[PDB]
Amino acid sequence: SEFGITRSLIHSFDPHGKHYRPTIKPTTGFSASADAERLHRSMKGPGTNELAIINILARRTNYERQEICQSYKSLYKQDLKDDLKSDTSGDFRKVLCQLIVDTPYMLAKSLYYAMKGLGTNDRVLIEIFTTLWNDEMKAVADAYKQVLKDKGSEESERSLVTDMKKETCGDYEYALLSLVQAERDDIPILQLKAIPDKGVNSIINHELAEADAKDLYASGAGRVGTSERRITRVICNRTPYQLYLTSEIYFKMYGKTLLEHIESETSGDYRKLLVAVLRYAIDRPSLIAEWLHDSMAGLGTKDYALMRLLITRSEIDLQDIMDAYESIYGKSLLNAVKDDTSGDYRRTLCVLMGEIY
Amino acid sequence: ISEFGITRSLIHSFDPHGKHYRPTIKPTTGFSASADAERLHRSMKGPGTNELAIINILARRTNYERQEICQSYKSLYKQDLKDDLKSDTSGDFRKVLCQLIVDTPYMLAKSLYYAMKGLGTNDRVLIEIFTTLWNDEMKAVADAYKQVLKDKGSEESERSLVTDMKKETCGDYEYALLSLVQAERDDIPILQLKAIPDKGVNSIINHELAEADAKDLYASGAGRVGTSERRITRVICNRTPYQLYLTSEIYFKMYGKTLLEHIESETSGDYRKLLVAVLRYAIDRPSLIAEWLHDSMAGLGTKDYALMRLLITRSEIDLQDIMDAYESIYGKSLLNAVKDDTSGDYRRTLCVLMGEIYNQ
């Protein structure tokens, strides 16, 4: 994998140092080989044993999935991704392809489709960029060049940045480019590992949050819109832990929540990006619950958001998101999904959420 | 008087089938600019502003009449109606009053200015406004914009509406947006428009053009990766509402998929929303604006100008038809939704625009 054994630990903890809860965790006694073989068995003769496939690929991490792919290749000298692609069809084949691909490639490909169609699917850009930290973003960028090649791009130096709108297009586009640069505030692995011990004071900074609050507060108004970067410089660079602190300080000081301030001072996609990044730090389960809810518009595989989100969030925080969703909507996420989808595609999603078949 | 002239352009005036759209505000055949001026003037004298009197005039006149009233009041009292209303009212009431006594094109230009001058871009507002302007209106707004820039400081005798917009290289949405602001959409001469109830919409559309357009529209899908696809933009943004409707019908008979569906599956982002807005402005307008009004009611008051902008503007064009659609769609009158989302003399002003007059 290009993402290592796990997504960045930066994503693993709520504002308070509490482990988010995934629906998928590395599999005790995992054997790529065992799984490769079992998958091989599940594709045979007329038809296919779909549930067998699901109960493996939808119960492993991206890293384990890639190990399986590598084991499969080694063994059968065949290609897992293809073997699946030939014996499945429709929506089920679609979700399987999103599953057997390395995460950064699966995201890079979505970014590719969001930009290369008619009109720019910014919702997807915002959705995906919000969820990547520096190293992941870099892996996604590299995956992107590989996607262009896989599409037969004859261009030597086409790139993610190359395909994106120019910073001069506006505040939103500049912020997007800022994030792609992949130079947000980072936390050493040591510190992150220790969050569930020392808590979070070690990785935040009051003098900083307080100063940033002052900057955030003084950013806005008209007459001067010449490169107003302060809001971007803070929201799009501070760690989720630091942003939370800034958020707390800002409300104590000013009497309006930092979120309300953003919603009031910015517009269009720029606002949507800022709101996404901030809520991903201070209000994530709800943010992604809402995203999931919006993704369910009876489109099936016509829109990828639903499966992209379930697949990715399954190994980070999908369970907390499931809980948020029910609180917000009165219906379990599991049921919303059962209602909006069908077939083996549906079964895959339910298993990703922890359902058993 | 008004850079829009006595009315909004007649090109907005008929539905796809040739029937007149129904406004909540029509030119008053007994209209006396001076008489209204006098009445407004009385309303303000003394420390007891009669809000109902003010609202029941200004919110019951077209933009042309309101401007006629401004002028008459100016010559009559050496005083500026706008100023006198501002100094005699406050809060949300003053806000809505200011949107109202300003010439439509200036009012739209100010909102465009704010949609761009701030942090990020209020594209929703650009789509909403540009969608609703035909060529001459657009040019009047462009002019008024230059006048907003002077009013707001700029000493740049050459900065304009297009200067402030995003460049066409920023993407399909931006390019399409710019094409509307180009103000080179197909025209229909007034005389032929006025004749529609006589001659029918058939006299004003082109079956052969629609077929050819329908084919170009369908082609925009194969080899979706080559050069910048502009054909959808050209057709959707330029055809008159009447031609687009015909194009929509013909497109469906040929391919068994609505033109809307086609657009919705082939395009994304603000580009889709702009195209969808423009198409629906032609073929599904009452519903389209009823939804716009619905989405504009989020309890923001005079912090979001969309609700009052839409009401003010649609009032003299097709607001009644939009009201019917609104209740069909949402199961509740637009009147009652508006009353629930607003209050004060502002609420009252909005209600009067839709026709609900309360006398004293």
Curated annotation (Swiss-Prot), chain A:
Binding annotation for Ca(2+) 3: 115, 117, 119, 167
Q: What does this protein do?
A: Involved in reproduction of the worm. Involved in host-parasite interaction. Delivered into the host cell by means of parasite exosomes. Binds to acidic phospholipid membranes in a calcium-dependent manner in vitro. Causes aggregation of liposomes in the presence of calcium, but not in its absence. Likely to promote membrane fusion. May provide structural integrity within the tegument.
- A GO molecular-function annotation: calcium ion binding
- Fetch the InterPro entries from UniProt: Annexin, Annexin_repeat, Annexin_repeat_CS, Annexin_sf
Sites where the protein binds Ca(2+) 2: 48, 50
Residues annotated as binding Ca(2+) 6: 296, 298-299, 340
Locate the residues binding Ca(2+) 5.
165, 168, 173
- This protein is called Annexin B22
Where is it mostly found?
other
Binding annotation for Ca(2+) 7: 300, 340
From Swiss-Prot, chain B:
- Provide the protein name: Annexin B22
Where are Annexin repeat segments found?
31-102, 103-182, 208-280, 284-355
Q: Which residues are Ca(2+) 3-binding?
A: 116, 118, 120, 168
Q: Where does Ca(2+) 5 bind?
A: 166, 169, 174
MF terms per GO, please?
A: calcium ion binding; calcium-dependent phospholipid binding; identical protein binding; phosphatidylserine binding; protein homodimerization activity
Its chief place of residence is other
For biological process, the GO terms are:
female gamete generation; membrane fusion
Q: Which PROSITE patterns match?
A: ANNEXIN_1, ANNEXIN_2
Q: Which GO terms describe its cellular component?
A: cytoplasm; extracellular exosome; host cell; membrane; nucleus; plasma membrane; vesicle membrane
Q: Which residues bind Ca(2+) 4?
A: 123, 270
SUPFAM superfamilies from the UniProt entry: Annexin
Localization annotation: Tegument; Secreted, Extracellular exosome; Host cell
Subunit (UniProt)? Homodimer.
Q: Which positions bind Ca(2+) 1? A: 44, 46, 48, 88
Task: Enumerate the UniProt keywords alphabetically.
Answer: Annexin, Calcium, Calcium/phospholipid-binding, Disulfide bond, Metal-binding, Repeat, Secreted
Chain sites annotated for binding Ca(2+) 2:
49, 51
InterPro entries to which the protein is assigned, alphabetical:
Annexin, Annexin_repeat, Annexin_repeat_CS, Annexin_sf
**Belongs to which family?**
Belongs to the annexin family.
The entry marks the following residues as binding Ca(2+) 7, namely 301, 341
Organism, as annotated: Schistosoma mansoni
> Pfam families of this UniProt entry?
Annexin (PF00191)
Q: What does this protein do?
A: Involved in reproduction of the worm. Involved in host-parasite interaction. Delivered into the host cell by means of parasite exosomes. Binds to acidic phospholipid membranes in a calcium-dependent manner in vitro. Causes aggregation of liposomes in the presence of calcium, but not in its absence. Likely to promote membrane fusion. May provide structural integrity within the tegument.
Name the residues that bind Ca(2+) 6: 297, 299-300, 341
Domain comment in the entry:
A pair of annexin repeats may form one binding site for calcium and phospholipid.
